[PDB]
């Protein structure tokens, strides 16, 4: 999921003379350099939107460095993962990693780990792509890390809700735009306010799952390459 | 990520509970062995996760090379709880107030609604409160007494029968206290008595106990903790075996002596007194780039100048940052190195973020823009000059450096009239001198702490400086009307020679033939014309005590200056003396600024 | 200044530790620096005292530098001036 | 001076000194130690 | 050292704020630093001429009779009022002190007499020809300057906008106003032309502005230091002193707020009533 | 109970900078020696780290250049003076201009 | 007579220079010198002498709980032990003696939390 979020942070300016020549561009460049692709305050910050509020460039009072800090309050688009969400692709890295984990190439860098207690585990190999469902133990958005950490497993007021139902409507257009034979095959394989919210969340999870499943497998040869999972799910009817 | 700049606005002191330690400590101490081989034992009291006392290894936790690592706390889960040694009195006061059987207070709380929060609990504890009965469980209240042999032991006596109040029982009693009782008794939420009993003490970061003394007590504490069984569930009246009693007493005394021994030096002994942490390390400090020497007089130095021996001017350095404007001026400093004066022995290349000695840079020959060079202190630099004790505001002032290139001179040389700032004399006094090397401190020193600022005393609003001793009597001799040999006059050559060492622009003697007898006061008026003032007072020379005897020349008993032309009288302590309010230097300061004074 | 300091609270408060408690009770760090740091530290801990950072001793004991003198007034960069003139 | 193996000691002072002493005495513990003495030629300097 | 450290830690938190008030954190200690807002290094002692003059002597010297305008009656009445106010306040100060006598010399930021003397010395013209228009203009500008004098404590912007001045700011500049009225009286500025008088007024304003205390100055430490040293000489003088004032005992009583019982050298000075019956020693003795 | 953090509202609410209008400021329009010294020091350090200047006369030390920029009214800094800390999270400052304001002695 | 450069032995505990000329580093600005410098309103010489030419260090305070933090920009660790996920580590200039002091007090189970000055934003 993606959603813009406002972040408050304090910068540091090692040359305030050059900084204030193009203050807004410099602020955008520094926030992009520091804050993209890293978790912060239970978020991931995919992209930096223009700042909302910024401070005058003060001068560091307590040290003779002559530098300045400036406080920045900016908005940024983040990626968050809720409970039992459905991400369609994980990529394994190491075979000496018998705990079984991998890396995700989606637009949500997450180190995904799968417990070795289930039947469909310990059978995969390095370099294969397998859909994984997040567990109930939430996601660790630890800061300063270039990718998030999470655990997962192989899958087996009226106008306020208008905004929620608005998101699903556009997501449907994403499904129709792309090729539909892969979507049909995958769907064959997998065939007041609070309850409305949770139902809408489940609908979002499943529809985003099918769309990302279609997207993940760009060409058809990987499907035969990863055919060992089709039987793995088919035996689980 | 990037840690943005911030400043501390307030500090909140709270009692740290067991959860505080458990979530604040980086690890848990389980094994008593200090070192394996020549490296810390993992899980020991010297574990590198808590800090570094050696340059060899990093902190693991923060990955910093000692000087950049501040230490991180460690956690030791006690097999049996311990009372907080700091808050023994608070524990006692809480016990007597509250019923030991249900957690409800037995003192009338409604009577304290009109009192300030700090006073409520102490006032309630001051009451009799003994032999009372509870209003919800009807349990009578035992009276609490303190043992006369140790500080942390509580004896609960119920009409004569004596039982020791153990830390487990005390902890349960405090865990029975409701938040309403704590709030209504003038204590914040964070001061709940439950926090006063520790099951997991904090092993301090090794950064505050470096070098392998107080670690002995820590290791002893861990060893004696291992001796206690891990499940010492002591209820009241259990009568645990006597060996367990002495072991628990030893653990409690060890923790108490770790915190407040003699208050080995414990943690709390480090704080108070002059040599303590506060009054020595915090309110004062030891510094680098500072020199101390014996002061001595130098009549040929300006009042705002100090004679810095050259041997010191090569030791202390001034950091000059290389830019486009100062490349050509800084080049002769760089070329000299340590071989000549002025030279420099350091270079901080920003691109490499490294500092190079100047005798290892025979092939560099290049200073980039943004490079920092540490050049020697040359004549004209500003320097702080301090004599201790620093009682007055003028005890620290900035003098322009005069480098004495005589290698046989090692004393700090100052003008005699500059002693009034520091209340100094040359009987063997020593004054610390340090040269500001940063740009910010140099600017501040020349613009704010220059001794011209302290020419007018902040204490008494009069001038501090003036002529002392030989200058006062010399001015008197110069301006007196009659020498014993006759009238006080000098030829052109000697009047010309009076102005040799003044260093100002000498006056014009072309109007005087070589045989013209210039008066004693004419030459003074020649100098005072540059800063004309008006002054009219009786001199110190004219005193009524001496008056009945001696013949007082009428031209000497009234000093009178009109527009800087000395008309009559003599100059003595009242006119030119130091500390004289209304003196000529005070007027010069008032009209032309203290620098001209 | 001496007289106005003692009489600022409507009562003559001494220069001793009692007077400092009366005038500045919340400045725990200042009273710690004055005398008996362990006792006033215990009192601050049990009272859950918050000590705002001001004056001389309070920021000195915290390792910072006091906001007096040269650094009483903050300095900011004139973005308009740099934008209009420096480039 | 007195290079010892590294646990050797340096001079330390900023005033050069002329050495006239080389002995190896037998201390209380019967062990040998250094005990080198240095001489300073002091004229009446400015500030004495 | 003991007394100085105690005093320093008592006073160190007193810092001059942006209003030139001395404040602890945010709580006031003083409405104005020295009650005048002036740095101790920028004070000069100058005599106030009108203080000791009798009413006819005051009229002889300071009353201007060269023009029959009532403006000069108003100016002389202002001079008389200032003299009376000074006498009243300092007679009261003398009253509640043991031996603090009234003096007409006071410490001020600007020595107006010296500035007038300098301008008159540098003046090209000698005895200026009589000109009523210039005299009235000079009086008007002196009066306007004195009215706008409390604005040196705020800024030029609030002077242009003529915004209200707080009462304590008006009171702070009362002494300088009185000195300026005394020294720039029309009877004393006859030879000073309008351009030279405006020069004098701007010079006075500049020296007043340069004499004010700085924002952020650590005045508490200044006071502690300034009072600590005189104690050293005070007790060294105890061997002339004997009513137990020896040592720091009296400073201990003052600084530690010792109660009346703790005093060792307590005294009272009681004035006899009926000021015509106290001139004789016998009745006082009885 | 609790580790002094869970109930700890330690994060102070962000403040909004309120700048007093130019006709409402009631602080001195003449730089205090502390403020002038701080301006000169900040400017001189910034010239040391950067080197740019607006001066015509070229000097060989950043201290001189910053001092002349203050004297010749081209120093690119603004002295902001803060007088409040309101409980409503509203920091009240008045931003002064060292170019317009008077300059103390400093000499 | 004594003169010291910017390098020398530093105290193991506080990080301050050693005592006197004999220990090859030191000389002291005691309480009185700090009082005098403050009375002059120095606060840039006090910064230089007390921090740059003494035990100068850069503390880190989480600003989300006020407890000291674990920060290192070279080996990336942006974490706190009290709120880990929600850390907002702030760079605070300080002195090593102050941190050692705060650790002594914390080891006495009196917890120290630094509020940190709040961020100030000019209006949109
Ligand atoms: Mg002496
Ligand atoms: Zn560390
Ligand atoms: Zn009960
Ligand atoms: Zn935190």
TrEMBL record, chain A:
Protein name per its UniProtKB record: D339L
TrEMBL record, chain E:
Self-association state and partner proteins as the record states: Part of the viral DNA-directed RNA polymerase that consists of 8 polII-like subunits (RPB1, RPB2, RPB3, RPB5, RPB6, RPB7, RPB9, RPB10), a capping enzyme and a termination factor.
Family, similarity comment: Belongs to the RNA polymerase beta' chain family.
Function: Catalytic component of the DNA-directed RNA polymerase (RNAP) that catalyzes the transcription in the cytoplasm of viral DNA into RNA using the four ribonucleoside triphosphates as substrates. Forms the polymerase active center together with RPB2. Part of the core element with the central large cleft, the clamp element that moves to open and close the cleft and the jaws that are thought to grab the incoming DNA template.
Protein name: DNA-directed RNA polymerase subunit
Residue numbers of the full-length protein present here: 823 to 1112 of 1450
Automatic annotation (TrEMBL), chain F:
Domain of life: Viruses
Keywords assigned: DNA-directed RNA polymerase, Transcription
One function term, GO molecular function aspect: DNA-directed RNA polymerase activity
A GO biological process held by the record: transcription by RNA polymerase II
Function: Component of the DNA-directed RNA polymerase (RNAP) that catalyzes the transcription in the cytoplasm of viral DNA into RNA using the four ribonucleoside triphosphates as substrates.
Subunit description: Part of the viral DNA-directed RNA polymerase that consists of 8 polII-like subunits (RPB1, RPB2, RPB3, RPB5, RPB6, RPB7, RPB9, RPB10), a capping enzyme and a termination factor.
Protein's name in the database: C147L
Protein species of origin: African swine fever virus (ASFV)
Gene behind the chain: C147L CDS
From TrEMBL, chain G:
TM ranges: none
Domain RNA polymerase Rpb2: 25-115
Family: Belongs to the RNA polymerase beta chain family.
Chain's role: Catalytic component of the DNA-directed RNA polymerase (RNAP) that catalyzes the transcription in the cytoplasm of viral DNA into RNA using the four ribonucleoside triphosphates as substrates. Forms the polymerase active center together with RPB1. Part of the core element with the central large cleft, the clamp element that moves to open and close the cleft and the jaws that are thought to grab the incoming DNA template. DNA-dependent RNA polymerase catalyzes the transcription of DNA into RNA using the four ribonucleoside triphosphates as substrates.
Annotated protein name in UniProt: DNA-directed RNA polymerase subunit beta
Organism: African swine fever virus
Gene that this sequence comes from: EP1242L CDS
């Amino acid at each position: 999921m993606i959603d813009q979020k406002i972040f408050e942070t304090t910068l540091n300016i090692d040359d305030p003379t050059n900084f204030c020549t193009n203050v807004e561009a410099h602020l955008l460049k520094e926030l992009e350099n520091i804050y993209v692709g890293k978790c912060f305050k239970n978020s991931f910050i995919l992209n930096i939107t223009g700042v909302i509020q910024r401070s005058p460039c003060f001068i560091m009072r307590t040290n003779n460095s002559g530098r300045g800090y400036m406080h920045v309050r900016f908005s940024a688009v983040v990626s968050y993962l809720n409970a039992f969400d459905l991400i369609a692709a994980v990529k394994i890295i190491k075979n000496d990693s018998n705990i079984i984990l991998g890396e995700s190439l989606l637009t949500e860098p997450v180190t995904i780990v799968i417990p070795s207690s289930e039947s469909q585990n310990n059978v995969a190999e390095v370099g294969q792509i397998v859909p994984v469902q997040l567990a109930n133990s939430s996601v660790y958005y630890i800061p300063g890390r270039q990718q998030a950490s999470a655990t997962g497993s192989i899958f087996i007021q009226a106008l306020n809700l208008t905004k929620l139902v608005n998101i699903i409507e556009m997501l449907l257009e994403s499904r129709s735009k792309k090729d539909f034979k892969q979507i049909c095959f995958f769907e064959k394989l997998y065939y007041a306010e609070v309850m409305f919210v949770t139902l809408l969340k489940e609908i979002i999870n499943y529809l985003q799952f099918i769309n990302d499943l279609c997207d993940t497998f760009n060409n058809e040869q990987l499907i035969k390459r990863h055919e060992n999972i089709w039987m793995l799910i088919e035996q689980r009817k | 990520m990037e840690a943005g700049y911030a400043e501390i606005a307030a500090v909140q002191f709270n009692i740290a509970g067991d959860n505080d330690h458990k979530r604040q400590g980086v690890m848990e101490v389980t094994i008593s062995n200090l070192f394996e081989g020549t490296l810390p034992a993992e899980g020991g009291i010297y574990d590198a996760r808590m800090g570094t006392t050696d340059h060899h290894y990093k902190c693991i936790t923060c990955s910093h090379q000692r000087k950049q690592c501040m230490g991180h706390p460690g956690i030791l889960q006690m097999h049996a709880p311990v009372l907080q040694p700091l808050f023994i009195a608070e524990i006692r006061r809480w016990l007597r107030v509250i019923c030991l059987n249900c957690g409800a207070p037995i003192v009338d709380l409604k009577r304290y609604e009109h009192l300030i929060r700090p006073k409520r609990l102490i006032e309630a504890a001051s009451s009799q409160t003994e032999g009372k009965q509870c209003y919800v469980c009807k349990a009578v209240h035992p009276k609490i007494v303190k043992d006369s042999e140790d500080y942390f032991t509580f004896w609960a006596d119920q009409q004569g029968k004596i039982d020791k109040l153990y830390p487990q029982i005390i902890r349960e009693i405090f865990s029975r206290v409701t938040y309403d009782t704590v709030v209504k008794l003038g204590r914040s939420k964070n001061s709940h008595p439950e926090k006063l009993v520790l099951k997991a003490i904090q092993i301090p970061p090794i950064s505050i106990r470096p070098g392998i003394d107080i670690n002995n007590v820590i290791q002893y504490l861990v060893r004696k903790n291992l001796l206690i069984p891990k499940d010492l569930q002591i209820v009241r009246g259990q009568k645990i075996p006597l060996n367990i009693d002495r072991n628990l007493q030893t653990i409690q005394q060890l923790y108490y002596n770790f915190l407040l021994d003699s208050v080995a030096p414990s943690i709390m002994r480090r704080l108070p007194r002059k040599e303590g942490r506060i009054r020595k390390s915090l309110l004062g400090s030891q510094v680098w780039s500072i020199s101390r020497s014996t002061i001595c007089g130098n009549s040929d130095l300006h009042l705002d100048e100090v004679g810095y021996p050259i041997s010191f001017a090569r030791t202390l350095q001034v950091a000059e940052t290389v830019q486009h404007y100062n490349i050509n001026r800084l080049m002769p400093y760089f070329l000299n190195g340590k071989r000549q004066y002025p030279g420099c022995s350091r270079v901080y290349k920003q691109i490499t973020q490294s500092v190079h000695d100047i005798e290892g840079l025979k092939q560099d020959f290049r200073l980039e823009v943004g490079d920092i060079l540490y050049r020697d202190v040359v004549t004209g630099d500003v320097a702080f000059f301090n004599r201790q004790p620093s009682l007055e505001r003028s005890s620290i002032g900035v003098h322009r450096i005069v480098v004495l290139e005589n290698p046989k001179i090692s004393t700090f040389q100052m003008n005699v009239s500059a002693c009034a700032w520091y209340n100094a004399d040359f009987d063997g006094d020593q004054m610390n001198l340090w040269v500001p090397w940063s740009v910010m401190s140099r600017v501040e020193a020349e613009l704010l702490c220059s001794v011209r600022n302290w020419f007018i005393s902040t204490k008494s609003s009069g001038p501090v400086n003036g002529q002392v001793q030989d200058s006062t009597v010399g001015s008197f001799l110069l301006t007196r009307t009659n020498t014993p040999m006759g009238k006080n006059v000098m030829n052109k050559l000697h009047a010309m020679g009076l102005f040799q060492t003044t260093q100002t622009d000498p006056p014009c003697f072309a109007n005087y033939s070589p045989t013209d007898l210039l008066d004693g006061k004419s030459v003074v008026s020649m100098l005072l014309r540059q800063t004309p003032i008006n002054y009219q007072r009786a001199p110190t020379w004219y005193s009524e005590v001496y008056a009945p005897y001696m013949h007082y020349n009428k031209q000497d008993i009234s000093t009178q200056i009109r527009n800087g032309e000395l008309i009559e009288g003599v100059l003595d302590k009242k006119a030119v003396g130091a500390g004289s309010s209304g003196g000529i230097y005070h007027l010069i300061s008032r009209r032309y600024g203290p620098q001209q004074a | 200044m001496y007289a106005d300091l003692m009489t600022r609270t409507g009562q003559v408060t001494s220069l001793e530790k009692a007077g400092l408690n009366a005038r500045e009770p919340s400045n725990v760090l200042l009273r710690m620096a004055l005398s008996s740091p362990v006792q006033v530290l215990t009192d601050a801990a049990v009272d859950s005292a918050v000590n705002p950072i001001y004056g001389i001793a309070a920021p000195t004991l915290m390792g910072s530098v006091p906001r007096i003198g040269t650094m009483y007034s903050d300095i900011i960069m004139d973005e308009k001036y740099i934008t209009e003139n420096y480039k | 001076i007195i290079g010892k193996v590294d646990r050797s000691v340096m001079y330390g002072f900023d005033e050069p000194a002329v050495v006239d002493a080389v002995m190896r005495p037998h201390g209380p513990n019967d062990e040998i130690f250094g005990l080198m003495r240095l001489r300073y030629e002091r004229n009446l300097n400015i500030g004495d | 050292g003991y007394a100085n450290r105690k005093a320093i830690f008592g006073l160190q938190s007193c810092i001059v704020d942006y209003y030139r008030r001395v404040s602890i954190d945010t709580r006031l200690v003083q409405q104005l630093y020295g009650e005048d807002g002036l740095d101790a290094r920028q004070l000069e002692t100058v005599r106030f001429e009108t203080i000791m003059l009798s009413d006819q002597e005051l009229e002889d010297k300071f009353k201007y009779t060269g023009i029959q305008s009532p403006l000069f009656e108003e100016e002389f009445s202002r001079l008389k009022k200032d003299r009376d106010k000074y006498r009243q306040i300092f007679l009261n100060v003398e009253n509640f002190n043991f031996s603090q006598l009234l003096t007409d010399v006071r410490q001020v930021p600007v020595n107006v007499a010296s500035i007038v003397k300098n301008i008159l010395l540098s003046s090209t013209s000698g005895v200026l020809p009589f000109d009523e228009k210039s005299i009235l203009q000079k009086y008007a500008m002196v009066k306007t300057f004195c009215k706008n004098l409390p604005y040196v404590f705020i800024n030029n912007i609030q002077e242009r906008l003529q915004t209200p001045i707080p009462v304590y700011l008006k009171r702070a500049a009362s002494l300088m106003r009185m000195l300026i009225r005394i020294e720039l009286a029309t009877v004393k500025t006859l030879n000073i032309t309008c351009e030279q008088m405006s020069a004098i007024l701007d010079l006075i304003r500049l020296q007043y502005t340069q004499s004010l205390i700085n924002y952020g100055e650590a005045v508490g430490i200044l006071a502690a230091q300034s009072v600590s040293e005189p104690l050293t000489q005070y007790m060294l003088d105890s061997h002339h002193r004997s009513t137990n004032k020896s040592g720091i005992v009296r400073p201990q009583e003052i600084f530690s707020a010792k109660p009346v019982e703790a005093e060792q050298s307590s005294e009272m000075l009681l004035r006899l009533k009926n000021p015509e019956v106290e001139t004789n020693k016998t009745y006082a003795q009885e | 109970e609790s580790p002094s953090i869970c109930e700890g509202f330690v994060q102070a609410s962000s403040q909004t900078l309120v700048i007093i209008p130019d006709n409402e400021r009631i602080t001195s329009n003449v730089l205090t020696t502390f403020e002038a010294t701080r301006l000169v020091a900040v400017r001189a350090q910034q010239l040391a780290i950067n080197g740019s200047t607006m001066l015509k006369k070229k000097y060989s030390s950043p201290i001189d250049i910053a001092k002349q920029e203050l004297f010749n009214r081209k120093i690119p800094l603004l002295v902001m003076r803060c007088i409040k800390v309101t409980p409503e999270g509203q920091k009240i400052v008045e931003i002064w201009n060292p170019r317009e304001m008077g300059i103390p002695l400093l000499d | 007579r004594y003169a010291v450069a910017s390098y020398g032995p530093t105290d193991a505990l506080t990080g301050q220079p050693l005592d006197g000329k004999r220990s090859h580093g030191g000389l002291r600005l005691g309480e009185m010198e700090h009082w005098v410098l403050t009375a002059q309103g120095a606060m840039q010489t006090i910064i230089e002498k007390s921090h740059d030419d003494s035990d100068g260090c850069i503390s880190y305070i989480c600003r989300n709980c006020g407890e000291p933090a674990i920060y290192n920009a070279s080996h990336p660790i942006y974490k706190c032990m009290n709120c880990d996920v929600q850390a907002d580590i702030g760079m605070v200039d300080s002195r090593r003696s102050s941190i050692v002091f705060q650790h002594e007090m914390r080891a006495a189970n009196v917890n120290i939390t630094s509020v940190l000055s709040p961020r100030v934003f000019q209006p949109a």
